[model samples]
Target: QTPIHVYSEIGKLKKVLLHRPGKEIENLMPDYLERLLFDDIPFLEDAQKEHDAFAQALRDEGIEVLYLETLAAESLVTPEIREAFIDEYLSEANIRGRATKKAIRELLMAIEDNQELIEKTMAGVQKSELPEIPASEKGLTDLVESNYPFAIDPMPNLYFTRDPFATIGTGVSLNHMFSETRNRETLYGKYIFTHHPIYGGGKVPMVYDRNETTRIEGGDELVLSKDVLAVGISQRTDAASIEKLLVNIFKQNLGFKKVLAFEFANNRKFMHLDTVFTMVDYDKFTIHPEIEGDLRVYSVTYDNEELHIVEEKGDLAELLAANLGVEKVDLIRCGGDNLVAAGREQWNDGSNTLTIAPGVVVVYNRNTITNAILESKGLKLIKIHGSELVRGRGGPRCMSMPFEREDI
Candidate 1:
């Protein structure tokens, strides 16, 4: 089996990677909610139960479920591999000094179980449980900010597995994340890809690595077809990152050429393209009505080793038809005709859906209006409970990262 191979958005899902919310969500205090990018705290146990139901729903649909934490834990089977992972992670965390980083590493290394170590890393290390750091060992920031509770911040956003990285055709993009709190989340991806026996040891290619300066996330990426990719230039992704990907794809000549870069409104509501639109079938999509008239589309192409960028103003459905070779696109409104209902559903991620097969999708059960609309359009809906899960402001699409899907 390949480490990653997703060529289209609406193919039958073969395998996926997910992270079940753990104590990390519980660690987030109200004082740090805004900073950690969580709108509200979720009941950790309930969230896990909901996540389990979501995973079960995927399994019921004949998809293999792989957990992100499980892969990360397995990647550190050897002491050398595990130590190196901890060292790299601590260094990137801005711990402030050689002594502090060394102390933290030593403390984490004492934990024998790899799974427990990984969980502790995601849960974060609090200052209360210290390994006796002397005044002489502290850095300037450490000395000045003595009141902070955590030596490492909790990765509350780990459950949103879609953002850290994305799987492209035969390869993976180890993304550079948008926020500092979510930035450390990608480190787990790096270690898994570079050390995991099934990935690096088996020789899987990485089209994009997190070492890049510019930021990009999986949410902004949509593998439209074998030859085309639709990336969102929203609050999460930048034009520079999109251009960098173009250079990589063209240089590799991975058979991919056209990139339809959709620039969304730079706001929290339209943070990622998937939040506004998602493909549910071969020629059908569920789109938010608010972004209908506000999209600025661009066609990015490479020829003769030179990149060409052309701004195009046209209807999104027509643009999809031109690239996809379809007669026309059937776009379904999220909440149908009512603007208020649409806005409410969109806010809860009504438009963010994970397509398992051509006409089968997994969506949040809370979005009743949108779910009803999708069913009316003849699409199969697998609704998962998101009472606590939606507190993180994501849906099924945001929670799962598909690695392999059947080719159309």
Candidate 2:
């Protein structure tokens, strides 16, 4: 069996991947929050507590939880692989000073423990952490940007593991992120799928490359079923990238027959599809009503290696019912028709519930309105506290990447 086997959104999740909030969360500052793609800084203590609870919730369901950092460290087994990783990391770090680059390289190489090395890379390096270079040795680029705080920016968004890469039926899409800050996170995925003992050695096929020019993110990719997929054209994933992904999936016979592409508002709050919609059961989905008015759907299929695309027109539920082969489909509104509740809850990612099994989901406890609505619909809820975790603008689904799931 392949390391990656996810084929349905509402399948029985058996194994998954996550990244605990690290010193990277502490590295976030208000002055450069936008640069790092963060709106506010989260208290590291509370964030860690919240993340731990999330992992425990999954464990309670008999699921195996794997940390991204741990897997990434395990992938670098040899001295040569470690050296190559550090060299490639430094090259893309965007270090301004020539002397500082050399200093940082030496610092990383000095760390023998691979796990610690991986964490340090995510936490970033500060000017104070390194010795000051002589005035004469400073390059023009270094001197001009002397006031900058980081030699390399912290990947605060690493905790949101869903955006770097996504797991699809026995394969993965190693995404090229929409922002430079998040793009670096994909390096870990590349290394894990290429070298790790259990998941690497090229056993997991990569449907998308991180070096691709067009941008895509895991948050926009959803496995609706064995034969259908749902992709969003949002702020984080481009339409062109979807076309490229479809061609690859079709050519590889990755078990998907048709893709229902949803085009919605390109806004940050609704950054990815999961932020506004997610499957909760076979015929039930949680949706943020705000996007329904402007949403457009398209159906894409491949025949004889040729692509066929068509605009789907009709009620969203009807279209989903037809495609899913269900008699009816229910669209559970995030806040149940109240504009104020919907706006507030959706902003906090109320719609982004991670379904561990059909009718069973893990959600943020903070979204009371949405949580109550799901319960009313007879869905089992595993509510987790996200007071600090939600500060990064993601919830259960956005924080997880399912690796193995039982076939529905």
Candidate 3:
């Protein structure tokens, strides 16, 4: 059985991946929040409790939940592989001082347990935790950068597993993320998919590589169906990256025939397609009303060793019905036309619903209006609390990555 087998958005999700909140959340500070792509800092204890409840909710539904940290730790079986991983991690950690780099490497190498080492990497290294460099040995950068507390920045966005990689029809798009902090999050995906006992050794075909210059995120990529895909050209994803992904998907015969590219608003609030819109059922979707106006759609089809791209013109729902072969598509407006509610809830990820099965979704209880609208539409809602989780500006869909889904 293939490790990755997601073919449709609303299929019955059988196996999913998530990351529980850890010390990374505690490491976030007010001054560095913007650099780390966080709007606010979340209290770590409550965040963990909320995340645990989210994981438990999924487990109750009979879906297998895999933790990213556990899988990453399990991947480092060989001593050689572990050493190489440490070397690579240090290289990408952006350590300014040579002495500081050596100190961090020694600290990581001394950790006897793989899980502890992995968690330490995610939690980041504090300058205070390391032995102080002697006055004589201190480099110019080290002395000049003494005000900064972290030797390596904590990956606070690690809990949002959906962005680092995406599962699409027996293949995975190990993304090249938009920001430097988020880019480091993909390294865990790389190690897990390349070295894990059950998922490694090239068992899964990589459709997109992390080393690519252009950017694309999993939240911007969606598997509408086995034959069709929906990619968003948003702030986090580039048009060139989409073209690259399309070419690779076509060449690999990853079972996708067409891609519906949606030109999303270039804003952080709607940073990803899934944040503004997500499939909740066969013919239903949760859409933020703010993005409906001036949204452009493009159809991309591959043939004759080339890609044919054409701008699509029509109502979004109608276009979706025609492409998905459904009689009609129901566009559920998030926040139900209240401008204030729309903006407030959208910022909190009201539209990012994780569809565990057709018509059954895992949402945030905080999005009361959107949840009510979805419930009225006959969609089964599994609401999770996001009081602390929303501080990261992600919802249920962004927090989880489906690994396997039963065919619809």
The estimated TM-scores of all candidates read 0.95, 0.98, 0.98
Which candidate do you rate higher for lDDT, 1 or 3? 3
- What residue runs in model 1 are displaced by over 4 Å at the alpha carbon? 96-102, 131-145, 265-268
| Pairs with steric clashes in candidate 2 | none
> Which residue pairs clash in candidate 3?
none
User: How does model 2 score by TM-score?
Assistant: 0.98
lDDT, residue 8, model 1: 93
Tens-place lDDT digits, model 1, residues 283-389: 89889998887789999999889999888787889988888889999999998899989989998999999999999999888899999988988988888899999
**All candidates' lDDT scores?**
0.87, 0.91, 0.92
1 or 2, which is superior by TM-score? 2
lDDT of 2 by residue, 1-408 (tens): 778999999999999999999999998888998778787889999999999999999999999999999999999989999898898888888988788899999999999899999999989898889987888888877677567788888999999999899998999999999889889899899889988999899888888999899999999999999999999999889999999999999877898999999998456557889888899999999999878888999999988888899999899999999999999999999987899999999888888899999999998888999999999999999989999999888888989999999998
Minimum summed lDDT over a 10-residue window in model 2 is located at: 264-273
Name the top lDDT candidate: 3
- Model 2 RMSD in angstroms: 1.2
Candidate 1 lDDT at 299 equals 95
Candidate 3 residue-wise lDDT, 1-408, digit = tens: 787899999999899999998999999889889889898999999999999999999999999999999999999989999999999999999998888999999999999999999999999988889997898898777777658889999999999999999998888999999998889989898998899998888998889999999999999999999999999999899999999999999888998999999997465557899988899999998898878885899999998989999899899999999999999999998898899998888888888889999999998898999988899888898989899999998999999999999997
